[PDB]
């Protein structure tokens, strides 16, 4: 599947450029939006808006670049039409066949840093997950804390959930683990 | 049903004092792929990628050569004019939990950067190590700055110390960060 | 990555309708224009499309774009005799690829 | 609009060929063509801004150069028979507007 890229527009001691354009997906394919972004040293100048419906100077330093893109038809119809042709182009393109469908599994373990019961998850490519600590049968729900997901970078996630409890010999705390790659609950327990 | 996805698609970064660029493709955050601008070829952080999508990597250059243009033209329109250097910051940590022996990997955050342009090197006890160092693009934050991670692979032990020093104009003075098993 | 036209030569006689197809492969053209080339000199632009059949342009020309088949057409009616050129039917994204061309001979 | 120098050359196998192409817009991007009969027009090297340059469909036996942004030269090393025809120079912006070609040039080679 080839995937199409966002086409810069031309205009009329350290510095940077930035171009981007966003396709910003919800539901799916369902509402598509389409933007783009000009960026001179850390001030986006030029943007234009899959709701807008053309380009809009965000700042005066771009009110020619704007004005010019969107007098030419050619121009301004092309910007337009990303929408179909890089958004969902690509969505159903190499998306769907390639970032979408990748799931992995997580790697589950408890541990213990006057304590506190952490449950760290790693190594899964689904954002959402639901993790639930259990004690003897019965469903904590007050000394859960998160650490927010850190993308490690290659496609993976990592999450930590804590747990005040302190642990007195005789019960079997159980970390539970939803979806982020298949649908058989994963469980790891802890005894003594 | 609802809320899902983002993708830029399409990101193109450029310096003028160094003719430096960067061309990258991100999906959800992650980087989808690089393109080379010296070898002119397409670049797959994830390989098992390619095998299925593809890109025309002269469909990069373009973006290269429109936005080297306009960087141009917009330096001339305000006059020549700098931008304020930014203080990088390093985060050390593992991708999975230590587990002495088993063999892990390090990775060196570094949120902060501006402009795109800093050295990331692993020490060893004190001494630079080179096999199993992977480092990925600049990946762009809401703020315009830039964020890159820069990975080390490992065998956790007890005697021993790693760190992660990070060069930056905007530090007159490396700053390690320093990571043990403790 | 490259585009087909297919009537190499083509004759038609005066207010006559003439047809000249276009096939292409890769998916990332979004802009299909035509070229006409007198025998005198240099190629031109004539018409051109982006993704969304049918155009108007210079009523007596049209073009009709087939995504789902990835084939196009140029269409001319009422052909005089002074549209006798060449024509080359082409694809573009980052760049613009042409087609064998057609060379047109309307019969007056 | 664009000029491309010789308008016509007769050379031998061998010999050091060099087309030129000043252009007068704001374009940035320059091709160089070749028209057969059968073929058409192919692209042989094409370049996005001065300095840049990039091979196309048969760019064998060529190499193009950009020195400024508003000149793009055609380069045959070693003339073959194999390069006779029509060479056309065209200039035009970024994404693919239209390009606007040159009047052309004839080149023929023999032994």
């Known amino acids: 599947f080839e995937a199409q890229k966002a086409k810069a527009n031309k205009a009329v001691r350290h510095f940077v450029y930035q171009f981007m354009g966003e396709c910003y997906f919800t539901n799916g394919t369902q509402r598509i939006r389409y933007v783009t972004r000009y960026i001179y040293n850390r001030e986006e100048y030029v943007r234009y808006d899959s709701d807008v419906g053309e380009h809009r100077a965000v700042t005066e330093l771009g009110r020619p670049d704007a004005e010019y893109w969107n007098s030419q038809p050619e121009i301004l119809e092309r910007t337009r039409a990303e929408l179909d042709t890089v958004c969902r182009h690509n969505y159903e393109g190499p998306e769907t066949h390639t970032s979408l469908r990748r799931l992995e599994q997580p790697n589950v373990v408890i541990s213990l840093s006057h304590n506190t019961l952490v449950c760290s998850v790693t190594d899964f490519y689904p954002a959402k997950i639901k993790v639930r600590w259990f004690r003897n049968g019965q469903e904590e729900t007050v000394g859960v804390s998160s650490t927010q997901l850190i993308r490690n970078g290659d496609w993976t996630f990592q999450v930590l959930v804590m747990l005040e409890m302190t642990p007195r010999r005789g019960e079997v705390y159980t970390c539970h683990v939803e979806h982020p790659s298949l649908k058989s609950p994963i469980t790891v327990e802890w005894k003594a | 049903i609802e809320a899902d996805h983002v993708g830029t698609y399409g990101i193109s970064v450029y310096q003028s004092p160094g003719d430096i660029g960067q061309y990258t493709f991100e999906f959800d955050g992650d980087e989808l792929f690089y393109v080379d601008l010296d070898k002119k070829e397409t670049v797959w952080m994830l390989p098992e990628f390619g095998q299925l999508a593809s890109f025309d990597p002269q469909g990069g250059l373009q973006n290269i050569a429109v936005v080297k243009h306009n960087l141009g033209v917009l330096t001339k329109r305000s006059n020549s004019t700098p931008a304020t250097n930014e203080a990088p910051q390093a985060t050390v940590f593992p991708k999975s939990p230590v587990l002495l022996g088993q063999p892990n990997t390090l990775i060196c955050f570094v949120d902060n950067i501006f402009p795109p342009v800093i050295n990331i090197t692993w020490l060893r006890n004190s001494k630079s190590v080179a096999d199993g160092v992977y480092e990925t693009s600049f990946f762009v934050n809401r703020d315009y700055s830039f964020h890159k991670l820069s990975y080390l692979t490992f065998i956790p032990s007890d005697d021993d110390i790693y760190d992660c020093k990070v060069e930056h104009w905007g530090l007159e003075e490396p700053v390690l960060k320093h990571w043990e098993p403790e | 990555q490259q585009v087909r036209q297919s009537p190499q030569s083509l004759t038609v006689w005066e207010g006559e309708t003439a047809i000249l197809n276009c096939s292409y492969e890769?998916?990332?053209?979004?802009?299909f224009p035509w070229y006409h080339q007198f025998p005198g000199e240099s190629p031109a632009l004539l018409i051109a499309?982006?993704?969304?059949?049918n155009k108007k342009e210079d009523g007596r020309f049209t073009i009709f774009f087939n995504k789902r088949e990835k084939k196009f057409s140029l269409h001319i009616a009422d052909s005089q005799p002074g549209d006798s050129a060449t024509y080359f039917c082409?694809?573009?994204?980052?760049?613009?690829?042409f087609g064998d061309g057609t060379q047109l001979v309307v019969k007056p | 609009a664009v000029t491309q120098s010789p308008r016509n050359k007769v050379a031998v196998t061998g010999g050091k060929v060099t087309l030129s192409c000043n252009q007068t817009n704001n374009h940035n991007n320059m091709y160089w063509y070749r028209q057969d009969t059968g073929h058409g027009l192919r692209l042989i090297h094409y370049?996005?801004?001065?300095?840049?340059?990039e091979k196309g469909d048969i760019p064998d036996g060529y190499k193009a150069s950009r020195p400024s942004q508003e000149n793009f030269s055609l380069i045959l090393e070693l003339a073959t028979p194999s390069q006779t025809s029509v060479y056309f120079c065209?200039?035009?912006?970024?994404?693919?507007?239209?390009?606007?070609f040159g009047p052309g040039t004839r080149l023929t080679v023999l032994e």
């Open positions: 370049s996005y801004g001065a300095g840049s340059t």
């Open positions: 082409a694809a573009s994204d980052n760049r613009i690829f």
């Open positions: 890769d998916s990332t053209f979004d802009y």
């Open positions: 499309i982006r993704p969304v059949s």
């Open positions: 065209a200039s035009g912006d970024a994404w693919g507007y239209e390009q606007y």
